[PDB]
Amino acid sequence: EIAKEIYTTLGNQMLSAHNIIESIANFSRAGKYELVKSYSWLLFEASCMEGQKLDDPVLNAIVSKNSPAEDDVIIPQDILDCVVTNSMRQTLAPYAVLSQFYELRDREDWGQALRLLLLLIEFPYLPKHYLVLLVAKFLYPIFLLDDKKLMDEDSVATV
């Protein structure tokens, strides 16, 4: 009980200290996976507003092993030894898809861009407002206002 509360407290200080990576890590620890999910949806929202994922020098070191460039030597020894097991590639895989989604749009790989967005939406953890945001930003203006796709009765039904 005492330990879990301290973790919650750490997260509040870390948010203040503008160490965005470290606050989520602390909430994970607090035993509140549900809250972890809620900041994930919010981070997706943030990443949409930026048009692309955030880059901090600490963030550059962890993520680099699935991202070109970005390997920046001389970040604390705790950060470097922890990540060696490749646990980060798995945990980062849903954010990575989002980030890759913008990339594919810009690369005029509009077919595949649609595919990644659909995969993310199918996960039932979205309730009705992390849906309102996506359709007006991406699905309706870019992909359904333009005709370039052949549908049929069933494909329409599923929609």
């Binding site: 996976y33 999910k37 895989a93 898809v97 039932p124 953890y125």
Partner: peptide, 25 residues
């Protein structure tokens, strides 16, 4: 993706459990 899906499923199961607990209340 697999990990994320698993986590989501776990969360959903937790929610179900909570609902059942309240259902009995």
């Amino acid at each position: 993706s697999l990990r994320s899906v698993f986590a989501t499923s776990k969360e959903f199961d937790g929610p179900c459990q909570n609902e059942i607990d309240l259902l009995f209340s």
